[PDB]
């Protein structure tokens, strides 16, 4: 398929969107960074402007917490697939998330499904389409969908579906990163910068 | 999706109509970082109600108060996705929300508002008022600001008149007045409205 | 209504337009303006370049008759109401009167509507659609439609509106300003700056 | 009406176009000129490219013959009227024609329809649309029309419908100003630059 | 008549194309160069974008076998006349033949029409419509027609319509020039440079 | 055909696309490279962004395992023919391979078609409409097809379409190159710098 489901990979993140206004889907991302000689964010398809904003809110938080300054990196983003009549989430957390991973080159867990919106202070803001999605992800066989926690009440799940996925709510990006980044030294050191 | 209690900087419950008649509470966040030439950033279905509305109160963001816009980037979102949402234009809410973010004076969440702002800062009337309010009563918003010329337009089916305080306004500072957190920072904004 | 009808307002003018088939709107413009904290005409939406235009050519009748410089002011020009399929007039003058207003703070006759094209060397040129326009204007319910001279012979009012509106005919930018700058000292001091 | 059919006039030509599939009509031009500060060309409505193809091609000629550099002017052109589904001709000669006039401030016979395309080299070129353009024109009361002479064979016109218009051919531009521009000491000076 | 069927000029070539549904026609271009004083390409009408992308290609080659860089220069492209429902050919060679011609002012034979897409590598790819095309050609009194080497089988030249016209099929632009540029000392140096 | 389906040729490669809903096309790419005479991508239409992107990423890679740098060449990337409503994959390899071609001037198996998306560290990521695409490369007779490996299990190739074409599961641009490059001396000086 268009997504991986088990494993950690750098700078690759399983996001979620809505196709039609009925079913949902995994919107898999990849982000890659190389040096410049000041930088653009390179992304095509119909979701390009969501790439662009996403990085734009994430850049800030990069400098604001690590001093790393990505006007010096060209940022490369592809929606692994192609996505007609798909609607993303404004400033998709999953996009900001892959870039944090790439830039830091700390691997990301793919068993772990994701969607929500994000902001320039670092808050995870609520998004349309939660159930479709939780539900899409139940379908992809992803183990835990992480979601914005204001949507705790928008989740509507048949007792029995409650059961198949670990729905984990959150509301700052530093918690997304703690629930996705691979364990290790690099991670430990990164987390504490978000204090 | 919208918060109905509390205050947050840069963060306003506008009201709009979902196609036919059906008001939606339609929330925003605005933020501002300075620029390293100044832009407006925003996305989804309503990106251009966003850029017209900021670019259209630009004069007024500077020409009463503090900083020129073409010196910050203005990051706007609508919190959720809004297919078939007809929004207002020169949205008092997008303006309120930017002002709020710039001065970091927080905004009242229990109080929805709808209106069109103008470049001299009137609050011109808009349509859908009764629909929008109903959305607001339905959502448990406590008060709602509307334009003064839409006063006549409000036909609430008894029981409903009494579920919501309907506040009519004219000028953008009546709007801010009525939604900003009381404090030094406002006493002070308020008076720069001469 | 989304338009006023009694009042003398500053930065404002009821220019007329044509949407859809033969149809009429009244399209209200609002001017508003700032010594520039070079200058700029900041405007929006479909008829932004019309505005730019109407101001550029109105800039010039002020720089040379009135001794002035628009170069030093951020000219805000907006439109009023949402109209798909709408159509401007080259240099449309409901604008330039709206504007000549901003800068002289001259108050305006919100009972006079108007259409028409403004040349640089000052003249009320003619615009097509002169009949239907007089009518979104009779519903508009307005006591005067100022038109260009050359356009008189396109006025075909039916039985239900002949004698329904004061169609005032005008040729220089000044019989526009004459029949719609509210009375007093500041008009008189300008009217003699032109005449 | 939206054009003048007699007397002369700085910077107005009565050009010609077709409307949807077939009617001839008249495409009135005003072009006017003002001091800059390196300049631009101002046109709004459907026919804006034509006008600026029109002028940028009319300068090299302004120089090579008269040394005005249109570089230091700001040219302002509008079509007098409202023009939907009307197709101009490429670098419409009427339009380069209104500009020589304004810039040279020598007036123009409005009794003479005209049409064709202007090569940057100063060639008058052949154009689609004669017979109906000459009708729109025989309908209008315009006494003569200059056509590119290459379209001489493309003029069908009827027994009763000849007699009523002077079709005149041209190949170069120095011949349109010759054939349209008011006579006067100004005119003779300029005719002499084109050698 | 929109074209010349005989004789030679500079920046003027007779392409070939089709009218909407089925039909074929002669499509006179003309392309002039003045220094850019960066080089924009310029042209208006329905063919306007078949003009820029055709030109923006060609110069791989325009730079590459021969004379000048065209970012230094300005391109004015007109289709002589007006072109309601006509599909032109991608990277048109009659455009390329024209721009090359206009840059070295080396006149083109107009008794020869050509059609075909120029690769950027300067090969001629095949183009549809060919049979139709050769025929507008024949209708039109032109003497020889260059076509693409691969639209050969596609030449369904009937009874009537054989021997009336010479078909010169070709595979390179450099061939296109050979067959149509004016025998002269400049051309001999042009041809050796496409060695 | 406008389509090479056998041979070996420099800068020419066979892309696939799903035009519209399921409809597959074969969409051939032409690369051409010019010693920038800093340097810049040159393409046209709906897919210029893709080509520029596919060139971006390709570069990171050539700059690496080959050590030659392609900011000193201008880059001409054509697509062959007119189809409409299309959706090229992000970083499409059809392109990236065409380049390394234009650049290593190493001609290419024209029997193979491919679809894919290129990462910057060069991984071949999978794209969408993988089935419909095999089906148009088939229906165009290309003796083989390259495809993203992660897309192997979405190949809904039936019992009708089972034994018609070499389907190639591929994980990285070098295997892509191993498999379409022409057996000889620079290829091997290539593939060997790619270890």
Short mmCIF file of N, CA and C in Angstrom, two decimals, chain B residues 37 48 51-53 55-60 62-63 68 70 86 89-90 117-120 124-127 149-150 153, chain C residues 1-3 9-12 30-37 40 42-45 48 74 76-82:
data_model
loop_
_atom_site.label_atom_id
_atom_site.label_comp_id
_atom_site.label_asym_id
_atom_site.label_seq_id
_atom_site.Cartn_x
_atom_site.Cartn_y
_atom_site.Cartn_z
N UNK B 37 9.08 40.23 3.10
CA UNK B 37 8.00 41.23 3.19
C UNK B 37 6.57 40.68 3.52
N UNK B 48 -9.45 33.00 1.30
CA UNK B 48 -9.62 34.34 0.73
C UNK B 48 -10.66 35.21 1.43
N UNK B 51 -7.56 36.50 3.79
CA UNK B 51 -6.69 37.57 3.24
C UNK B 51 -7.31 38.94 2.83
N UNK B 52 -8.59 38.92 2.46
CA UNK B 52 -9.28 40.13 2.12
C UNK B 52 -9.57 40.81 3.44
N UNK B 53 -10.39 40.11 4.26
CA UNK B 53 -10.60 40.57 5.64
C UNK B 53 -9.25 41.13 6.35
N UNK B 55 -6.27 42.03 4.96
CA UNK B 55 -5.72 43.14 4.08
C UNK B 55 -6.74 44.29 4.15
N UNK B 56 -8.00 43.97 4.44
CA UNK B 56 -8.96 45.09 4.43
C UNK B 56 -9.13 45.86 5.77
N UNK B 57 -8.40 45.51 6.84
CA UNK B 57 -8.55 46.27 8.07
C UNK B 57 -7.14 46.72 8.47
N UNK B 58 -6.23 46.47 7.53
CA UNK B 58 -4.85 46.85 7.68
C UNK B 58 -4.65 48.34 8.14
N UNK B 59 -5.25 49.26 7.37
CA UNK B 59 -5.29 50.70 7.66
C UNK B 59 -5.59 50.84 9.08
N UNK B 60 -6.67 50.17 9.49
CA UNK B 60 -7.32 50.35 10.78
C UNK B 60 -6.53 49.65 11.91
N UNK B 62 -3.18 49.42 11.96
CA UNK B 62 -2.25 50.48 12.23
C UNK B 62 -2.99 51.80 12.57
N UNK B 63 -3.67 52.44 11.60
CA UNK B 63 -4.20 53.87 11.71
C UNK B 63 -5.22 54.33 12.82
N UNK B 68 2.43 48.26 11.77
CA UNK B 68 1.90 48.04 10.42
C UNK B 68 1.96 46.53 10.11
N UNK B 70 2.15 44.87 7.13
CA UNK B 70 3.09 44.43 6.13
C UNK B 70 4.43 44.35 6.83
N UNK B 86 -20.73 29.57 3.87
CA UNK B 86 -20.69 30.98 3.46
C UNK B 86 -20.29 31.83 4.62
N UNK B 89 -17.42 38.77 5.48
CA UNK B 89 -16.30 39.31 4.67
C UNK B 89 -15.90 40.52 5.41
N UNK B 90 -14.62 40.90 5.42
CA UNK B 90 -14.17 41.93 6.41
C UNK B 90 -14.78 41.50 7.79
N UNK B 117 -16.93 44.51 8.67
CA UNK B 117 -16.15 45.65 9.16
C UNK B 117 -15.82 46.48 8.01
N UNK B 118 -15.66 47.72 8.23
CA UNK B 118 -15.35 48.47 7.07
C UNK B 118 -14.04 49.24 7.24
N UNK B 119 -13.65 50.01 6.22
CA UNK B 119 -12.26 50.53 6.27
C UNK B 119 -12.10 51.77 7.11
N UNK B 120 -13.25 52.36 7.35
CA UNK B 120 -13.44 53.47 8.28
C UNK B 120 -13.90 52.86 9.63
N UNK B 124 -20.92 47.09 9.05
CA UNK B 124 -22.02 46.98 8.04
C UNK B 124 -22.87 45.68 8.22
N UNK B 125 -24.13 45.67 7.74
CA UNK B 125 -24.90 44.55 8.10
C UNK B 125 -24.54 43.39 7.22
N UNK B 126 -25.00 42.24 7.69
CA UNK B 126 -24.71 40.96 7.06
C UNK B 126 -26.02 40.17 6.99
N UNK B 127 -26.07 39.05 6.31
CA UNK B 127 -27.33 38.35 6.26
C UNK B 127 -27.29 37.17 7.18
N UNK B 149 -27.66 47.43 12.08
CA UNK B 149 -28.69 47.32 11.04
C UNK B 149 -29.28 45.98 10.87
N UNK B 150 -29.02 45.06 11.75
CA UNK B 150 -29.61 43.81 11.52
C UNK B 150 -30.65 43.56 12.63
N UNK B 153 -33.91 42.60 11.79
CA UNK B 153 -33.84 41.27 11.11
C UNK B 153 -33.95 40.07 12.05
N UNK C 1 -31.25 46.92 4.51
CA UNK C 1 -30.48 46.78 3.19
C UNK C 1 -28.96 46.75 3.48
N UNK C 2 -28.22 45.82 2.78
CA UNK C 2 -26.77 46.20 2.42
C UNK C 2 -26.50 47.50 1.38
N UNK C 3 -27.17 48.70 1.57
CA UNK C 3 -26.78 50.18 1.13
C UNK C 3 -27.50 51.36 1.96
N UNK C 9 -22.38 61.12 3.93
CA UNK C 9 -21.21 60.43 4.37
C UNK C 9 -19.99 60.78 3.55
N UNK C 10 -18.86 60.89 4.27
CA UNK C 10 -17.48 60.92 3.72
C UNK C 10 -17.01 59.53 3.24
N UNK C 11 -15.80 59.39 2.67
CA UNK C 11 -15.43 58.11 1.94
C UNK C 11 -16.52 57.16 1.35
N UNK C 12 -17.51 57.74 0.68
CA UNK C 12 -18.61 56.92 0.17
C UNK C 12 -19.51 57.48 -1.02
N UNK C 30 -16.42 52.54 -0.66
CA UNK C 30 -16.10 53.32 0.51
C UNK C 30 -14.69 53.66 0.32
N UNK C 31 -14.40 54.94 0.33
CA UNK C 31 -13.02 55.31 0.45
C UNK C 31 -12.64 55.60 1.88
N UNK C 32 -11.35 55.48 2.10
CA UNK C 32 -10.74 55.84 3.39
C UNK C 32 -9.16 55.98 3.38
N UNK C 33 -8.58 57.07 3.89
CA UNK C 33 -7.13 57.37 3.51
C UNK C 33 -6.08 58.10 4.51
N UNK C 34 -4.77 57.73 4.35
CA UNK C 34 -3.61 57.92 5.31
C UNK C 34 -2.27 58.45 4.66
N UNK C 35 -1.91 59.77 4.86
CA UNK C 35 -0.48 60.05 4.84
C UNK C 35 0.34 58.82 5.31
N UNK C 36 1.34 58.43 4.51
CA UNK C 36 1.61 56.99 4.47
C UNK C 36 2.55 56.37 5.55
N UNK C 37 2.14 56.30 6.85
CA UNK C 37 3.10 55.94 8.00
C UNK C 37 4.32 55.05 7.62
N UNK C 40 0.40 53.77 -1.52
CA UNK C 40 -0.28 52.59 -2.20
C UNK C 40 -1.85 52.48 -2.19
N UNK C 42 -4.50 50.15 -1.87
CA UNK C 42 -4.66 48.86 -1.34
C UNK C 42 -6.14 48.60 -1.66
N UNK C 43 -6.35 47.69 -2.64
CA UNK C 43 -7.70 47.05 -2.66
C UNK C 43 -7.80 45.54 -3.07
N UNK C 44 -9.04 45.04 -3.24
CA UNK C 44 -9.41 43.62 -2.98
C UNK C 44 -10.41 43.03 -4.03
N UNK C 45 -10.31 41.72 -4.29
CA UNK C 45 -11.42 41.06 -5.01
C UNK C 45 -11.46 41.32 -6.51
N UNK C 48 -10.45 45.20 -8.07
CA UNK C 48 -9.23 45.84 -7.56
C UNK C 48 -8.49 46.71 -8.60
N UNK C 74 -1.86 55.92 1.55
CA UNK C 74 -2.35 54.57 1.37
C UNK C 74 -3.85 54.62 1.24
N UNK C 76 -7.23 53.23 0.77
CA UNK C 76 -8.17 52.07 0.97
C UNK C 76 -9.47 52.27 0.19
N UNK C 77 -9.77 51.29 -0.66
CA UNK C 77 -10.95 51.35 -1.44
C UNK C 77 -11.66 50.02 -1.41
N UNK C 78 -12.88 50.01 -0.89
CA UNK C 78 -13.51 48.76 -0.78
C UNK C 78 -14.84 48.70 -1.50
N UNK C 79 -15.34 47.49 -1.71
CA UNK C 79 -16.67 47.42 -2.22
C UNK C 79 -17.79 46.83 -1.34
N UNK C 80 -19.03 47.08 -1.69
CA UNK C 80 -19.97 46.75 -0.72
C UNK C 80 -21.07 45.85 -1.19
N UNK C 81 -21.08 44.62 -0.63
CA UNK C 81 -21.97 43.49 -1.03
C UNK C 81 -21.12 42.46 -1.81
N UNK C 82 -21.66 41.22 -1.92
CA UNK C 82 -21.00 40.10 -2.67
C UNK C 82 -21.64 39.91 -4.07
#
